[model samples]
Target chain A: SFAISGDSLISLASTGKRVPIKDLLGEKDFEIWAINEQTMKLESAKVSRVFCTGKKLVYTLKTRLGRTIKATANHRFLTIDGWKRLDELSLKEHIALPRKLESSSLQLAPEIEKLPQSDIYWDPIVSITETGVEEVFDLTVPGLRNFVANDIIVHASI
Target chain B: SFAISGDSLISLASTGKRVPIKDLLGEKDFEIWAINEQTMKLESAKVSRVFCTGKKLVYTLKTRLGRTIKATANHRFLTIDGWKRLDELSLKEHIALPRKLESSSLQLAPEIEKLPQSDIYWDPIVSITETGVEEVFDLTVPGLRNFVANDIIVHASI
Candidate 1:
């Protein structure tokens, strides 16, 4: 995710084209696909930062483009033909590919404010068991005396 | 956890009839039960400490007492037909009296060094979707040159 400071594809010149940001940095090391586009749009991103977890790429980029792309990232605007390409790669390599890219340029982790207490961490777990009727527990006590669930939590706490 | 130091409980004893360990922090404030009990096991417990986990009370007494006795704690024990008296208290006060009295000798929270892991943190979730079997990902290789996984992972770097 990057930008050039200009009006239209018609604007901005040689910006981000200096010593380091140039050479092989642009489309090859970054965008990957738009390397040969005749003209590139001008982006004046005030802030653009990307971070990733093992399973996701999350980012925050403030700028303008053709679309109000707040952050759909790699998951955005897929073409039927586009996904077919990955299918070929998946089959040819005898590996499964992610069906739908979850990478998105939206709703950048809303729980950052409340943090650990409210952080939405989702992962998969596999277990061996069978119960027709099931139950789950919610241990969300409003507040702990001076500590947190994270502090005093032990197996019994769970 | 429990311990018994006859030296501490002894050398610090008043000979109850004397001046030192008596006159002040007396019989009423501490152990009235043991101080008054006739058949006190003459605990040779050099170290006697008792630990409770609400669900279990474990203690380690000394070289004496022969067998470890965890808690007389509250009269929460029954010598049979003995607790029939609390019913007399229950009806008089409109509350369900605990047949065996256990009370305010409590404020709880145990330390958590011995916390267990692999407790699986089990929780259940069900999905209506049919199953088969399912499931690398985007691990775009760059210079691989100087970087790698467990360090800098790319979505393409599964």
Candidate 2:
């Protein structure tokens, strides 16, 4: 777990040492991008002025809509847990692997463990009904676009 | 001179290793504070953030006139030569000790070589006349609060 720190420096749970976003992201990094609607394709925004709080990236990224938002990106593990937490709270719809993915009675084999470019997003209209979502999800800043929600937040570290 | 870089990470001139400001400021540091006028006495405004270029502390300090001005602080010898490029260009004022201090008229001796609380500020303002001072500082965010000049440079970086 990442430290719940207000400052941009992340107190790494593994080492308990403070690390800045630039050092974490290194000199150059792939821009992790996303889509707000499954019907919508992958998209990107120019990102800069990176900062971090706990396990998230806070940055200024401009949208194709010409809107700029300084916001947080959920860490991978947190994104995984977000869905489970949403189910626990009943704030979001439950989802799981289909019959094709469950282990069967016979010894089974699949073509690949997971499929590439097969990630799915759950679009939940965030009503903020519950209390701990603030602590649970990384969407600390407001006015995010339709795509960003409890499942995964904004994407950036620079 | 420190790199006039769009990138906050610097490949150190000494070691050629990229170093970020947080690592430079290190794990624990007293927040560097300031004063705009000696006549105004000591004051603090709950400074929200801070930045460093090389070793100089770049910050906004409130004036005795109640106007906030961006200023740079000399961090001991860390700010030793922000003027090197300016000297190289000959576009700014030249300043330094006129003569090296050495054993002079008598057996030269002083208890303490450097005085306590002795700090000096570079007077970059040309005075235009002598009524006021401008051409004051940097980190000027595009069109700032009307007093800063040197025009619309973008303030940035990760």
Candidate 3:
């Protein structure tokens, strides 16, 4: 997590653009201010600064109540534990079961099997208490490969 | 430069009977508190902490306007060239004058020529300045071994 200094909007090369807010709301609050651009000024004060690392973007925001919040974002494919580490891209030449896989499960099957048997480890699915709005995405397929019926379907969202 | 924290004050080590203020004054002002013996009320709000390095004693007093004053007395001697250097003490034997001189002027004179010619050097004279209040000793003695006339007597402060 990183901190920003002021409320002025800034661009993050990895996450596109960010609007620092004073508070993170579970649901959008229309009563606070209308969604329209003119009424947005009535919302709570946001003071923050922005910075970008080579692989990620960090936002530091200070609220009207003087509390600080830090946020970080990055492209899903570039993370160290991300799908890029699977080496699935190189598997296209060695696999004989057609040129495409149907879903993330299908694409991961061969890669998982190819991994050294002794190296396999699975963690328990832990429940996470919600602190703020967060999202995850997976984008592992090329444009042409995505067009095939049996090609892997990548997940992408904010 | 920075406000002192309470944790720093609580962390001070007890040294015998006297609680040395110098030890506490080293920390910033915000870290200290004056507790009333009966009521335990903290009244003094604005306090400045001053520290004297040479002396080990610490003092806490109220200013004319009710501000708290905390300080440590540091009374260590200041050497001729500021503070004592390691080599100054270590080179005493090598730098001592030879015992061949016999005249009163040879032992008491501050002038280099009155002593041995070999000891003569174009050394600069050091004097006291108004800025250094803690420096009470004269760094340079103009007449090291000269005695006054029999009728003249001198008294020195201890």
Candidate 4:
């Protein structure tokens, strides 16, 4: 399975708070806001499995907005051309980012609540660089098959 | 996708000879002998895709039979209980290895032809240690979803 570095923050479904991916290493069941591929919208999905995929080489994907995420090169992110490997993406391509995140159980962070659109934000990828190895984590979010990490929509695997 | 270090050798389908995974990095079409999960036998499968998954931390899984493989921790290996992640395995569990590999396109290697059984080998895992990061590669074998690496049957990913 592909995964992101442990330091990347995942947006929690209940509190709308963000926490480092490694913090949920041994967690059995928890909720996170993930992408519903069919509707291409956000939904609450239960994390079925969590894997500490060991320390490994990572690539830092920096966006024009200054948001960056460190992840394995094989990890997938939603793009205009559908899901594409991080390594296959280029600067001309943009990744799917949540325009706004509204939590059902709690209020979202003020910054998220202030987005101009309620749908999607296609953030331009500015650079992709090789970063040193770091412990990584992958989660099984069964149905949706994707999750929000570093505020960007990413694909998941078993 | 999960992958093995680039230096890991893959058993070629036609030659019955082994070549480093990195050697096939950019080549388009090629065939390799892979495991058929249903029959649990070897079959020739065309490699649909190849990926240089960047350098990453790896673990060395040494078998009592003197075989070894350096791969990402999350990579899965065929075990008695089905496929298990490299990290989930220990010395108590053994992995599936080929007892014999017969080639259709050419004569088998002298060493491969000398094997007694034409089936499986349950090689006891002697040790699993952290080996520093190195470039890794993963292949898509399409139908079978697995390939032989360092002479061991390992699961594939996309």
Instruction: Sort all candidates by lDDT, best to worst.
Output: 4, 2, 3, 1
Q: Residues A1-158, candidate 1, lDDT per residue (tens digit)?
A: 21211110110123422221222222321211111111221112111121221222222222111111111122211122221121122211221111101111011222122111211111111211121221111111111201011111001011
Instruction: State the C-alpha lDDT per candidate.
Output: 0.17, 0.24, 0.20, 0.76
TM-scores, all candidates, are 0.12, 0.18, 0.13, 0.45
Candidate 4 chain B weakest lDDT stretch, 10 residues: B103-112
- Interface RMSDs of the predictions, in order, are 29.5, 37.3, 46.0, 29.8
Cα lDDT of model 4 by residue, A1-158, tens digit: 57899988888787757888898887857887776666766678988877898888899998876779999989998887898998899996888876442211011122222122234567789999999989899888888878788878888775
Residue-level lDDT tens digits of model 3 in A9-115: 22121332333322221222112110112321112121122122222233332222122222333211111233231122221121110111111111122222112
By TM-score rank, best first, the candidates go: 4, 2, 3, 1
**In model 2, where do residues sit more than 4 Å from their true spots?**
A1-27, A30-108, A112-118, A123-151, A155-158, B1-158
DockQ, each predicted model: 0.00, 0.00, 0.00, 0.01
Q: How far out, in Å, is residue B13 in model 1?
A: 19
Please state the error at residue A92 of candidate 1 in Å. 33
* Model 1 C-alpha lDDT versus the unseen true structure: 0.17
lDDT (10s digit) by residue, model 1, range B41-133: 111111121112222222222111121212211211111122221112221112111111111100123322222211111111111112121
**Residue pairs of candidate 4 with colliding backbone atoms:** A57-B56
Runs in model 1 lying further than 4 Å from the true structure: A1-158, B1-6, B9-26, B29-158
Candidate 2 residue-wise lDDT, A1-158, digit = tens: 22121322322323324443345432222222334334333333222223233333333322221222233332221133432322232323322210111111111223122222323322332232212222212212112121222123333221
Per residue, candidate 2 scores C-alpha lDDT tens digits across B1-158 of 12121222322222323443244432222221122223211111121222344433333322221222233332011112433322131213422211111111011223122211222222222211111222222121121111111110112112
The best candidate in terms of lDDT? 4
